Each structure stands twice: as C-alpha cells, then as structure tokens.
Amino acid sequence: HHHHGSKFCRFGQRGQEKPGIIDADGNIRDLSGVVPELTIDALAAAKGADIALLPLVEGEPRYGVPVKGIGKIVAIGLNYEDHAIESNLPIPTEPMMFMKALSSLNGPNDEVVLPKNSTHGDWEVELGVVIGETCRFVSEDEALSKVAGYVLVNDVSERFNQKQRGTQWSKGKGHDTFCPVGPWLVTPDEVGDPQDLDVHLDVNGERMQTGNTKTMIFNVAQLISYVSEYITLYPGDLMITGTPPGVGEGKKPQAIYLKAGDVMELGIEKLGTQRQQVSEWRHLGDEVFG
Amino acid sequence: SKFCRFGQRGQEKPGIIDADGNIRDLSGVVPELTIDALAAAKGADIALLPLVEGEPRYGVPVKGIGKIVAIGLNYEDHAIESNLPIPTEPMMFMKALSSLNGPNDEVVLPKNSTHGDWEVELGVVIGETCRFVSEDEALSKVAGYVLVNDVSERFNQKQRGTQWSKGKGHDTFCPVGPWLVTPDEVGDPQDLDVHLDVNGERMQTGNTKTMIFNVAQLISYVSEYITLYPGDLMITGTPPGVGEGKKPQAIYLKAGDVMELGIEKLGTQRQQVSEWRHLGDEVFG
Ligand SMILES: [Mg+2]
Ligand SMILES: [Mg+2]
Ligand SMILES: [Mg+2]
C-alpha cells in the first residue's frame, strides 16, 4: 500500500458497472482482474494494484457512482462563511444535519429529472466524504483517518418542497436523481488537504457558484466528529459537507431556478467534473437508480 | 403469516411462527427472510419445518431494509392533547438506518442524555416500488406490518436546530419486530390497539383508527417526494402519552428503565434502557 493516492471509479451501464482506476493520462484502467467490485472492502486490494499492468478501457463508458454499497447519506446545512455573509445568516454554533434519501443517489453525469410541478429546482456543488472506518464518538484529531476518500456531489434541491411544505428539509432533498455523485472516489493521499480545494458550478455555461473549501465553517474532521455523536457512520456512508455561495435561491434581485433543458456543470479540484442535463418530470416507472 | 429472524446479531436465520406460537426454521426453504423471499416462505409447508430449539433472540424480522421514512404528528388525539393544529400534509423525516435494532435489544441512551423518550408506532414494510402511487393502490404495495419504537432524544430533536432527525438516529433507537405480519393476517391497519408501558406503568394508549393520515394516504404522499423500494420501512407516528407531554412535568428515560410495548396482532417488545457507553465497533441492525 503506497502513499501517492488513487482515483477509483465504476464504469458501464446501470446495474452492469465494473471497477476502475484513473491513470495519469485520464484513461480508465479496468480493475476487474484485481477486484470484482469497487466496494470499501475492495480498496485494500485495489490500492495495491500496479496501474501499468491494467488494461485500458476502450470507448467512452458511462461513469456510475464510484463506490458500491453507500448505505446512507448524511448532509450538512449552512457551512461556508462566505455563504452565510451573502445570505445574512448567523454563523452556526453546531452543524445543521439532515438526511439525503438514499434513493436520490445517481451517477455523476446522469439526467436530473425535476419532480412534479417543480419551479424551485436548485443546484449545490459540495465536497462529499466517503467513510472507510466506523465513526462512533470519534474525536476531531482522529476523524480524518476514518475517511476512505472524497467525491464530487451535487446536492440538488427543490426549495418549495424543502421549505414550504413543513420545516423538514429532507422532503425537498430526496427526489429521484437529486444526488449525482462522482466521477471518482479520490483517496486522501491524492486529494491532499481537503480544506484547500477550489469549487465551482455553472448553469448553461454561466458561472453560478465559486468558492474554496478553506471558507468551510466546520472542517471535515469537525463535521465527522460532531455527526458521530448523533449517528454512527459506517464504511461506505457518504457525508456531503455543504455548499459555497451562489445557489439559485439566493440570486439577486430575484431567485433563479432550474428549468427543463438546463445544463449543470460542476467541479472540485482533484475530484473531476460532473455534467447533468435537466428534464421535466415524467413517471420513472420501476427504474432503480444509484 | 408471521415471519421473523432469530439468532445472535449478524447470524440470524429466517423463521415463521406456527399455530402454537413456536418458531419454525425456514432455512430449508429460503436462505434469508427478504422481501423477495416472502412468496416462497409464505408458500412453504410449515409441517416440514423443524422446531427451533432454545429460546433464541429475535432480530429485525426483515433483512435488507434500505431506508426508514418516519412521520411526524399523526394521531388526532395526540394533536388535541398537545393542543397543536391538525397538519394539512404529513411531516416527513428520515430515521437513520443505523438506529435499527432488534425488538428486545438493549436501548443505550446517548451521552449525557436526559431527554430520552418513547414512541410506539405502527411500522409498514414496503413490498413493491412506490413511485407516485395513488391512495387507492397504496395498500397493495405493502409486504407486511411490524411493531416499532421510534425512540427519541427530545433535546437533540428540537434544541439543536430545526431538523428532527438529529434526535432520532442514535444507535439502538429503532427497535423493530418481532414479527413481519402479512396484510392478510393484520386485516384493517386502521383498527389496531396500541400501547406502551414504562416500568410496568401504562404511558401510551391508543388505536390506529385516530391516525390523521392513514397508511394509504401516507404511502401515496411520501411516494411523490421519495421513492420507496421493496424492503423500505415507514413508521407512521405515535398516539398520545409520550414522556415529553406528561403533566405536571415531562418524564424522560433513565438507566434501568424497562419499556414494554405492543400493537394488536404484531407481538410485543421489551427493552432495557442503559446509560451511555462507547459501543466500540458493533454494527447494529
Ligand atoms: Mg447541501
Ligand atoms: Mg415460546
Ligand atoms: Mg415518531
């Protein structure tokens, strides 16, 4: 096990994904000969593989969620100081927590389907944290050692369902397709300091969110430590750590929201990029996502 | 039919309750008690099944619960008692999957907790994908019903922000079971007696008839905001009598307490309550 870090992915159509690793040239390398699936338990074997000996993946396959078996998704509310200032909101003394319904999980470039009658759809680029070891009353000093890696996330939100149908945010957060995750699970040795990564999100090519994780209010270690006093985080769990300024709900003089045909493009330094096309609601039938 | 899972945590086997109340081993028919296994388990010849020996622990009666959707205020008599208005749509929050526990398993209070509280609830286990389902079709998506205790920490729930889930996801705070009872045996889910005792003293008494949104209304509403997949658990609120609302003063859980609860046709739970300790590397559920 080396100390240079890895970028893992899962590639292929839904339900048929295969484990992979990104080489220095940006190619996917097939890990199927080393591990059957990219799970948290598979990482030890995957982290020891010799990239040079792995076959190049031909074509341009779909990226899936980069880790299989995410058990639950814990989400943070206000957590960027420059966002608090732009919204004129108090700096919290403890993190706001809510749950992102697992059924919202989707691949990084998968279509975003607006829910019924949605005119308040909104974007939130966030740093995601994938847990590698159980977190139960973990101190700040030991929190980051529990991390399997980092992932890019869009915490897609329906602001009417989130705030105008009661006080509980999860009602506007759990819609099918509202949590695209990926394209890479990037292990800590490759990310470096998670509190110094540039963040952005564009809509139809126009820059909406710009930030850097150095303005996080609670850093990753403090979030993991705090959350672990209220819920146990298990290997494979995902924590999404909040969003920088520039959400559509906060635009001035009037809020700006998603519409059918919009294109979101987002990225975080070291974590790759996502692109989602937004569609009007349709009945998704018996399809399973994630 | 009443299905169960028996044995030590992480080692449970699938079972069915026979006419005498004894557990019979289903392992010769299905390897696990999953939603996909129910048809084969329901269609099995109970006489072929061996009696389970010893008095084994009951586990969560269904394997593979993917997520737990919880309902807020949902009993008309509870709303009246608390002097709260009747909600016009159900409050939803998520009950952390890691709170899942066996029906009779120890309940560990969180660190320095003085606001631990009880909530007997009817649980609904989903059998078929629910995505924008009509009220008329909702009950047909149900695999079975289960007894639940929506254990809560009222200070974490209400005094650390506006989101209730922070006081509801603690380890051990969702005892589920002992039986997954299929709808044919339960009959009308809106005519079930409900009760919870603490140290043998009756705390909660009710009947599901007073639900504000019934199971079909809840499934239909929830399915417009979050897709329910087979194996998902919906917990549908609690009748009056929670410790938070006791008068002249609220009463909360303490180390040494014993909770005993039951819902008609769904069996009974008994939990001993303990003060906090670090639970190590244990994986609950
Ligand atoms: Mg967010
Ligand atoms: Mg007996
Ligand atoms: Mg409840």
Residue ranges covered by each domain of chain A: 73-279
- Interface of A to B at Cβ within 8 Å reads 71-72, 77, 94, 96-99, 101-104, 115-116, 134, 136-137, 161, 165-172, 174-176, 229-234, 283-286, 288
Asked if B111's CB is within 8 angstroms of A229's CB, the reply is: yes
Question: Quick one: tokens of B183?
Answer: 């709808």
CA distances from A258 to A152, A174, B105 (A): 20, 17, 47
Residue of B nearest to A94 (CA): B160
Q: Minimum-distance ligand to the CA of B51? A: 2
Q: Which residues, including other chains, have CB under 8 Å from residue B68's CB and lie 6 or more apart?
A: B94, B95, B96, B97, B99, B100, B174, B232, B233, B234, B235
The alpha carbon of A155 and the centre of ligand 1 are apart by a number of angstroms equal to 5
Q: What is the DSSP string of A81-145?
A: HHHHHHHT-PPPSS--EEE--GGGEE-TTPPEEP-TT-S-EE--EEEEEEE-S-BSS--HHHHGG
Residue of B nearest to A228 (CA): B170
B134, A139 contact by CB (below 8 A): no
Q: Minimum-distance ligand to the CA of A128? A: 1
Task: Say which of B165, B171, B283 has its CB closest to residue A99.
Answer: B165
Question: Quick one: tokens of A96?
Answer: 């706001």
Asked if B164's CB is within 8 angstroms of A230's CB, the reply is: no
Q: Please give the order of strands across the beta sheet that includes B258-263.
A: B107-108, B268-274, B258-263, B193-198, B201-207
Q: Which residues, including other chains, have CB under 8 Å from residue B247's CB and lie 6 or more apart?
A: none
Asked if B98's CB is within 8 angstroms of A99's CB, the reply is: no
Q: Please give the order of strands across the beta sheet that includes B92-94.
A: B23-25, B13-17, B2-6, B180-181, B142-149, B120-126, B233-235, B68-71, B92-94
Distance, CA of B61 to CA of B179 (rounded, Å): 6
The alpha carbon of B236 and the centre of ligand 3 are apart by a number of angstroms equal to 7
Task: Say which of B69, B91, B167 has its CB closest to residue A166.
Answer: B91
A180, A109 contact by CB (below 8 A): yes
CA distance A290 to chain B (A): 12
Q: What is the DSSP string of A31-90?
A: -TTT-SS--STTHHHHHT--GGGSPBPPS-PPB--SSS----EEEESS-BHHHHHHHT-P
Asked if B156's CB is within 8 angstroms of A230's CB, the reply is: yes
* Chain A residues close to B163, C-beta within 8 Å: 77, 96-98, 167-170
- φ, ψ for residue B142, nearest 5 deg: -90, 130
Q: How many helices (H) and strands (E) does chain A have?
A: 6, 18
The alpha carbon of A221 and the centre of ligand 1 are apart by a number of angstroms equal to 18
* Chain B residues close to A97, C-beta within 8 Å: 161, 163, 165-166
* Chain A residues close to B94, C-beta within 8 Å: 98-99, 101, 170, 174
A-B contacts (CB, under 8 Å): 113
- φ, ψ for residue B63, nearest 5 deg: -90, 140
Q: Which residues, including other chains, have CB under 8 Å from residue B38's CB and lie 6 or more apart?
A: B3, B127, B143, B144, B182
Distance, CA of B63 to CA of B9 (rounded, Å): 12
Closest CA to A112 of A290, A244, A260: A260
At B39, is the secondary structure helix, strand, or coil? helix
CA angle, residues A99, A105, A106, in degrees to nearest 5? 160
Q: Minimum-distance ligand to the CA of B92? A: 3
Task: Say which of B98, B170, B227 has its CB closest to residue A176.
Answer: B227
B118, B284 contact by CB (below 8 A): no
The alpha carbon of A127 and the centre of ligand 1 are apart by a number of angstroms equal to 10
CA distance B51 to chain A (A): 35
Asked if A170's CB is within 8 angstroms of B94's CB, the reply is: yes
Residues, CB within 5 angstroms of ligand 3 (ion): B 119, 150
Q: Which of B165, B174, B279 to mutate to test binding with chain A, by most A CBs within 10 Å of its CB?
A: B165
b/e map A146-180, b = 16+ CB within 10 Å: bbbbbbbbbbbbbbbbbbebbebbbbbbbbbbbbb
Q: Which of B98, B156, B164, B171 to mutate to test binding with chain A, by most A CBs within 10 Å of its CB?
A: B98
Distance, CA of A10 to CA of A290 (rounded, Å): 12
CA angle, residues B90, B91, B92, in degrees to nearest 5? 110
Closest CA to B106 of B278, B259, B241: B259
Asked if B169's CB is within 8 angstroms of A168's CB, the reply is: no
Closest CA to A72 of B36, B99, B144, B174: B99
At A19, is the secondary structure helix, strand, or coil? strand
CA distance A24 to chain B (A): 37
Q: Please give the order of strands across the beta sheet that includes A18-22.
A: A28-30, A18-22, A7-11, A185-186, A147-154, A125-131, A238-240, A73-76, A97-99
Asked if A169's CB is within 8 angstroms of B163's CB, the reply is: yes
CA distance A138 to chain B (A): 10
Q: What is the DSSP string of B191-246?
A: S-EEEEEETTEEEEEEEGGGBSS-HHHHHHHHTTTS-B-TT-EEE----S--GGG-
Task: Say which of B92, B160, B171 has its CB closest to residue A232.
Answer: B171
CA distance A134 to chain B (A): 7
B165, B235 contact by CB (below 8 A): no
Asked if B92's CB is within 8 angstroms of A170's CB, the reply is: yes
Q: Minimum-distance ligand to the CA of B71? A: 3
Residue of B nearest to A96 (CA): B161
The alpha carbon of A268 and the centre of ligand 2 are apart by a number of angstroms equal to 58
Q: What is the DSSP string of B149-202?
A: E--EEHHHHHSSSS-GGGGT-STT-EEB-S-EE-HHHH--TTS-EEEEEETTEE
Closest CA to B96 of A224, A97, A96: A97
Q: Is A135 exposed, middle or buried (0-12, 13-18, 19+ CB in 10 A)?
A: buried
